Amino acid sequence: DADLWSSHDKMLAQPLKDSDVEVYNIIKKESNRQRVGLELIASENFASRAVLEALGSCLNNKYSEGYPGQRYYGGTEFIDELETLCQKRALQAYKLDPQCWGVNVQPYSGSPANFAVYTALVEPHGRIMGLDLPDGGHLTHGFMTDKKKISATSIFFESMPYKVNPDTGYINYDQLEENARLFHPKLIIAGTSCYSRNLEYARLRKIADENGAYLMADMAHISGLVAAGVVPSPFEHCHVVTTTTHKTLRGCRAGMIFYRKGVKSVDPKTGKEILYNLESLINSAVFPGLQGGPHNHAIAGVAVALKQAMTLEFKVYQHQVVANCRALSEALTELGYKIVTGGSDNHLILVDLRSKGTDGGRAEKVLEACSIACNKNTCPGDRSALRPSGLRLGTPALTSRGLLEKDFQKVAHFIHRGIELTLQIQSDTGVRATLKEFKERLAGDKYQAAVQALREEVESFASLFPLPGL
Numbered sequence: 001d002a003d004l005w006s007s008h009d010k011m012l013a014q015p016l017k018d019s020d021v022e023v024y025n026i027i028k029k030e031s032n033r034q035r036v037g038l039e040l041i042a043s044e045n046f047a048s049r050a051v052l053e054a055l056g057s058c059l060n061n062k063y064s065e066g067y068p069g070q071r072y073y074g075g076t077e078f079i080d081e082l083e084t085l086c087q088k089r090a091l092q093a094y095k096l097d098p099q100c101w102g103v104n105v106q107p108y109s110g111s112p113a114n115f116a117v118y119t120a121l122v123e124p125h126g127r128i129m130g131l132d133l134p135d136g137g138h139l140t141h142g143f144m145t146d147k148k149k150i151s152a153t154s155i156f157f158e159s160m161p162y163k164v165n166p167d168t169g170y171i172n173y174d175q176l177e178e179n180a181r182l183f184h185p186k187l188i189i190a191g192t193s194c195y196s197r198n199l200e201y202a203r204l205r206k207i208a209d210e211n212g213a214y215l216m217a218d219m220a221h222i223s224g225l226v227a228a229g230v231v232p233s234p235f236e237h238c239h240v241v242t243t244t245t246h247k248t249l250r251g252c253r254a255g256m257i258f259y260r261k262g263v264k265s266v267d268p269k270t271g272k273e274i275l276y277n278l279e280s281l282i283n284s285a286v287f288p289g290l291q292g293g294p295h296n297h298a299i300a301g302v303a304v305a306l307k308q309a310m311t312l313e314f315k316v317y318q319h320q321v322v323a324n325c326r327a328l329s330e331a332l333t334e335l336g337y338k339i340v341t342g343g344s345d346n347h348l349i350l351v352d353l354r355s356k357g358t359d360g361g362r363a364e365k366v367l368e369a370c371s372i373a374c375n376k377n378t379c380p381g382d383r384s385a386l387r388p389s390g391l392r393l394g395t396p397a398l399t400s401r402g403l404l405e406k407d408f409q410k411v412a413h414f415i416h417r418g419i420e421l422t423l424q425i426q427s428d429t430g431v432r433a434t435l436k437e438f439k440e441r442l443a444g445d446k447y448q449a450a451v452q453a454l455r456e457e458v459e460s461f462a463s464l465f466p467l468p469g470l
């Protein structure tokens with residue numbers, strides 16, 4: 001009667017460790033995996049303990065559909081304090097005049113943030129232009145083939161990509177300018193997932209105005225760098241700026257949408273001023289358009305991450321991120337590796353493995369087997385996305401653990417050793433071999449000892465550094 005009811009109360013207060021050992025262990029094994037490994041996936045990072053704590057708060061429970069001062073349900077005085085605080089901070093982090101900029105901090109992640117913007121400004125079947133996927137663009141920027149529209153962006157809107165010059169490695173703004181006059185985009189996306197150089201925002205803005213299109217920046221990858229001023233800000237030339245809250249910003253998974261406010265334009269003779277309406281449209285799209293109840297626990301993590309993003313420690317961190325990237329880039333360049341574009345203005349680089357006689361697909365697996373985390377990626381000039389020539393390496397994750405230039409040089413050496421091992425296996429299985437066979441030889445008995453040797457040396461080196469979280 002009441003024996004089991006007390007057991008119920010004990011169930012909701014019982015620690016994860018006892019309540020679900022199966023899930024507890026998976027988390028433990030994962031924490032260990034992250035500790036002993038070398039994280040070089042550009043999109044990765046480590047959230048601060050303060051941010052992670054906010055996620056487990058009672059904020060999870062409150063349904064707060066709507067916005068501060070425009071809620072559906074009542075009892076949101078504390079939730080309103082939090083959301084208003086989070087957006088106040090978001091504007092500060094980028095030094096934005098509240099009278100000129102506004103922000104929506106409700107997007108569940110980066111992709112939902114982007115889609116929300118298209119839904120509000122582009123509308124069904126409206127045209128969008130983004131960097132081609134194999135050229136370093138993101139799925140949310142549009143992706144389709146002769147056969148089908150793959151990304152939701154291509155499915156609900158009409159997208160056509162602009163490309164990177166296969167020779168230089170830089171975005172071909174000239175071809176974009178030409179095609180925009182033919183396509184008539186309603187919105188141009190200025191953002192990348194795998195690009196080492198700064199974007200010519202002013203030029204993009206010019207091309208946008210010529211076609212009466214919106215210029216939307218997707219700063220997901222460089223959000224942290226832009227915050228610390230380590231890279232030029234997209235806010236000066238863009239109408240809308242979307243972003244992820246994790247990655248280089250070090251918060252929890254979520255997203256934000258920044259939009260222009262105030263005077264859009266004026267009439268020379270009448271003096272009548274037209275104002276921006278981005279705030280209303282974008283807010284309406286997030287809710288009641290696309291999303292439901294806000295994830296207040298995440299909005300807290302974001303708010304916390306934004307306070308940290310404004311500290312000097314963070315600024316130093318971001319400068320170190322770029323310094324480590326330069327160190328890593330030049331170390332590999334000196335070693336005969338071809339870096340697309342020759343270098344980088346940010347946290348990542350794209351290494352063209354054709355310079356060493358191999359590809360990123362094979363190199364990715366070998367490096368993984370040795371606890372070196374990174375991802376394959378097509379290079380400008382690749383005749384097939386099935387056999388990508390490069391590897392995308394980013395420094396934010398390891399930099400957060402304390403790594404410095406000297407450490408990144410050691411990391412560069414470790415990476416090269418992985419490539420040697422890759423080359424060995426590649427030649428050992430023949431020149432007409434498939435990726436399927438390569439994976440088998442890698443997990444085979446012949447290279448078992450070599451992999452373990454390198455893996456252990458990698459793991460013992462990574463183990464020397466702290467792992468933010470706990």
Ligand SMILES: *Cc1c(COP(=O)(O)O)cnc(C)c1O
Pocket residue numbers: 043109110111112114137138140191192193218220221244247253254
């Ligand atoms: C990371 C990223 C996103 C957001 O991805 P989510 O996994 O949905 O958070 C969107 N656009 C770009 C360019 C990104 O790099």
